[PDB]
């Protein structure tokens, strides 16, 4: 039963709150994963969570210095949603540092970048099974999503980055159907910069919201549809999404170049003119989440929004943050579901602790009523293994 | 239902990274079994892992002198692959100190040997049941594969060895049809020694390259059909495989006496005249692995490659390595697919610790790009119970 | 576990040439940044040059572009440094250091050194 997806984003009000793993809490006295960059997938019965270890359990001497992304022992695995992320209930997908997955209605497709830094090595599986490989173009580090790539149609889309991190890099659109690479584009984005794009199905066509590394307080977004013909620009919303960012005021459709040469993936969803902009509270840390309806904030720069809604507080950690959606062959409706992630960083490199980890809590949206509060990871550092 | 049969092997130029358990960065906090020998078995559903567990946890007092091979207490279970082999996540198999386990379609087959050394019994069990006892015909350590046995067409195949470890020993392929041993012929190979052989069908056929103990640092085989008729001989090439191994020379297709009286089990693919070489780097210590093409390796004796691919570093620890195939029924493709697993040795007898352990990392050939890297096991060792 | 130990300094005359040699174990250059670091007698550290996990070279110190030379290899886990037409203000003390780019938080500061080795120039 391949996805239809010619269906359009459901009309939503507010967020309710979907899960809550508590790895962490349950982590300093179980044996759970070292993870990062958790993100959820639905499949058309179920959905996961997809995490990368560090290859080692928390509150043990191996999660020393985890604060480091790129090493030989991380692997792709997953567990149910809602589940802290154990050695005992994980499934083992791909051996990477670097990864995105997705369910096509038949198997589960997954993509995993390991090796070093100028020839790393994307290994596609298809229902467990080596498929493809894609290799590094520009010899340096090659990279991927961090969150579920799209399915339209029998076909899943994903984009890569491969090239410097603080300049013009490369930008590819993958199409894979059943594991094979079938058709893939370079994108022409002279001055614009893509990394860890969130992207999501709509009316047939892919959308996909990216964090700009280089030179944007604001979000870029890129959409195409199954022929990967594209579009590209910003958010031109005057309240920005990125973070490291300046105080609201006037915004713009092209790169915003003010406190903008870093940032962290996040999403946004767009309804005609309007967006859903998710990003968190302090302008400066990685502190805080809310969730922003600007009426008109996809063409306008005008600063002023309608609706807030409150996810973590300023005083509390944030993380990343992705979107994915639940098909109609799963939810049984006759739109596609807009639903969120948050990562919630504990540990380095802000803490004084020996490891970096993360939980995450995850939220659907719905048209009835909801309210705002915090949810917050809710661990008491620093752990044993730090004394 | 059946397997295989006349799929010829698939072309291949490098191998991607299939799976990595990091069992003993895990088992350091972790309920984790100390196994050694690990091999993996894929089914027409899945692959799984078979290991043989000392009868203790890592890091722990039980663990004590666990370097030795042969204990009543030593059981074959198997976990899905890339997964930590945990006592709650791992499916007991046979009680066994050596062991071989394939699948013929519809059920899984074990072998297990345990006993006195003079008397070890082969308990052959389908589907879980006990279906045929083979003793040992010397009354000398009776010994099996360690890796998987091969099916074609319904019947399972595997070799076996009784007699001595430094001298002429008997040799038997035995052929399994859903448990019952129907056939089995002991080979007529004087001045030859074959012990924990790697099979794999091949066009109908089965080849198996195995380890020899006596006098020869490179590496038998024997290839038969489904009558077992048989040929033997060693791989000619110059680039010997077992270890301890001389210096890469002039080889030979007779034993090659020269520092060749031990050796580690290992494989190698014929493809026409050429062969893919697993060994290790170094030539004295296990340490180090590389996959060595040697395009006229299976019949000339020169010492000239064409391609290396790097698995692990020389300065990290390596081990047991062996072949298993995924049969057309289980990736879908018109070829049989080789893959290899390696076990990286982490203990006794080269680190002072009390215990011995190892965990795995396996690749599978494939004929897109692919990278040299290491991927080593990363245990920090000695843990707190050698304290 | 992991380990840095330079080699190659000695006396040498000026306008001379030599060559170091940082022998690393433990952990990979493809994923690590390493840098040469040098001290005068009398002054603070310096930073010679620094060289990327991918290979390519990032900085050079001012005074030491045009004569130093700074290569690797990968499956030694060897950093080097040529030095040619030496002069004596290139009398110092020299370390490798190493730090990490992170994909996410970036740049992470130099974490692991050696003992280094002396270079002089006399007469």
């Known amino acids: 039963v391949t996805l239809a997806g010619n269906s359009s984003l459901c009309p939503i009000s507010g967020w309710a709150i979907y899960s809550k793993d508590n790895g962490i809490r349950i982590g300093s006295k179980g044996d759970v994963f070292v993870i990062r960059e958790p993100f959820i997938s639905c499949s058309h019965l179920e959905c996961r969570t997809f995490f990368l270890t560090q290859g080692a359990l928390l509150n043990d001497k191996h999660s020393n210095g985890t604060v480091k992304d790129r090493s030989p022992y991380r692997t792709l695995m997953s567990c149910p949603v809602g589940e802290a992320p154990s050695p005992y209930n994980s499934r083992f997908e791909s051996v990477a540092w670097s990864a995105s997955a997705c369910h096509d209605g038949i198997s589960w497709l997954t993509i995993g970048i390991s090796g070093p830094d100028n020839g790393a090595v994307a290994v596609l599986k298809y229902n467990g099974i080596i498929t493809d490989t894609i290799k590094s173009w520009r010899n340096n580090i090659l990279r991927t999503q961090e969150s579920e790539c799209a399915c339209v149609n029998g076909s899943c889309f994903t984009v890569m980055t491969d090239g410097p991190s603080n300049g013009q890099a490369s930008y590819k659109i993958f199409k894979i159907e059943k594991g094979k690479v079938v058709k893939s584009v370079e994108m022409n984005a002279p001055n614009y910069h893509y990394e860890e794009c969130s992207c999501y199905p709509d009316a047939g066509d892919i959308m996909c919201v990216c964090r700009d590394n280089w030179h944007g307080s604001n979000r870029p977004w890129v959409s195409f549809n199954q022929n990967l013909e594209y579009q590209i620009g910003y958010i031109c919303s005057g309240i920005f999404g990125d973070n490291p960012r300046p105080n609201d005021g006037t915004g713009s459709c092209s790169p915003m170049p003010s406190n903008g040469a870093y940032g962290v993936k996040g999403f946004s969803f767009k309804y005609g003119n309007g967006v859903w902009i998710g990003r968190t509270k302090s302008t400066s840390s990685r502190s805080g989440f809310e969730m922003i309806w600007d009426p008109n904030g996809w063409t306008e720069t005008d600063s002023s929004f309608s609706v807030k809604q409150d996810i973590v507080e300023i005083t509390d950690w944030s993380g990343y943050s992705g979107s994915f959606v639940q098909h109609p062959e799963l939810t049984g409706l006759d739109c596609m579901r807009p639903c969120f992630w948050v990562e919630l960083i504990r540990g380095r490199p802000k803490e004084n602790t020996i490891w970096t980890s993360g939980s995450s809590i995850s939220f659907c949206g719905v048209n009835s009523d909801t309210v705002g509060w915090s949810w917050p990871d809710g661990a008491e550092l620093p752990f044993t293994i730090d004394k | 239902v059946t397997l295989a049969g006349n799929s010829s092997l698939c072309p291949i130029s490098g191998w991607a990274i299939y799976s990595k358990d990091n069992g003993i960065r895990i088992g350091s906090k972790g309920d984790v079994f100390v196994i050694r020998e690990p091999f993996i078995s894929c089914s027409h559903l899945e692959c799984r892992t078979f290991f043989l567990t000392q009868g203790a946890l890592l890091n722990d007092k039980h663990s004590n002198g666990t370097v030795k091979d042969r204990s009543p207490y030593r059981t074959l279970m198997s976990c899905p692959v890339g997964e930590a082999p945990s006592p709650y996540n791992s499916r007991f198999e046979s009680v066994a100190w050596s062991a071989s386990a394939c699948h013929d379609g519809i059920s899984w087959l074990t072998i297990g040997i345990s006993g006195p050394d003079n008397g070890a019994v082969a308990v052959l069990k389908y589907n879980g049941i006990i279906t045929d006892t083979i003793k040992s015909w010397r009354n000398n350590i009776l010994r099996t594969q360690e890796s998987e046995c091969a099916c074609v067409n319904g019947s399972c195949f595997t070799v076996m060895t009784d007699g001595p470890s430094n001298g002429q020993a008997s040799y038997k392929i035995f052929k399994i049809e859903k448990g019952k041993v129907v056939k089995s012929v002991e080979m007529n190979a004087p001045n030859y020694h074959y012990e924990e052989c790697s099979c794999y069908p091949d066009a109908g056929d089965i080849m198996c390259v195995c380890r020899d103990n006596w006098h020869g640092s490179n590496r038998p085989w024997v290839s038969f059909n489904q009558n077992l008729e048989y040929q033997i001989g060693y791989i000619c090439s110059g680039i010997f495989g077992d270890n301890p191994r001389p210096n890469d020379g002039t080889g030979s297709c007779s034993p090659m006496p020269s520092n060749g009286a031990y050796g580690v089990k290992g494989f190698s693919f014929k493809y026409g005249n050429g062969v893919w070489i697993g060994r290790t780097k170094s030539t004295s210590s296990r340490s180090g692995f590389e996959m060595i093409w040697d395009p006229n390796g299976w019949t000339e004796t020169d010492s000239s490659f064409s391609v290396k691919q790097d698995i692990v570093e020389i300065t990290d620890w390596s081990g047991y390595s062996g072949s298993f195939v995924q049969h057309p029924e289980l990736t879908g493709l018109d070829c049989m697919r080789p893959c290899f697993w390696v076990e990286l040795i982490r203990g006794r007898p080269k680190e002072n610790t009390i215990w011995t352990s190892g965990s795995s990392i396996s690749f599978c050939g494939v004929n897109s790009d692919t990278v040299g890297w290491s991927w080593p096991d990363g245990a920090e060792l000695p843990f707190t119970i050698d304290k | 576990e992991v380990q840095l130990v330079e080699s190659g300094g000695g006396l040498v005359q000026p306008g001379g040439s030599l060559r170091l040699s940082c022998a690393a174990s433990?952990?990979?250059?493809?994923?690590?940044?390493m840098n040469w670091v040098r001290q005068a007698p009398g002054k603070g550290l310096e930073w010679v040059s620094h060289?990327?996990?991918?290979?390519?070279?990032?900085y050079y110190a001012d005074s030491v572009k045009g004569r130093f030379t700074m290569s690797r290899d990968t499956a030694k886990n060897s950093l080097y440094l040529q030095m040619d037409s030496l002069t004596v203000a290139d009398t110092a003390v020299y370390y490798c250091?190493?730090?990490?780019?992170?994909?996410?938080?970036?740049?992470?500061?130099?974490?692991?050194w050696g003992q280094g080795t002396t270079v002089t120039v006399s007469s």
């Open positions: 060289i990327s996990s991918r290979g390519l070279v990032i």
């Open positions: 250091a190493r730090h990490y780019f992170d994909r996410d938080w970036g740049y992470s500061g130099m974490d692991l």
């Open positions: 433990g952990f990979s250059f493809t994923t690590y940044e």
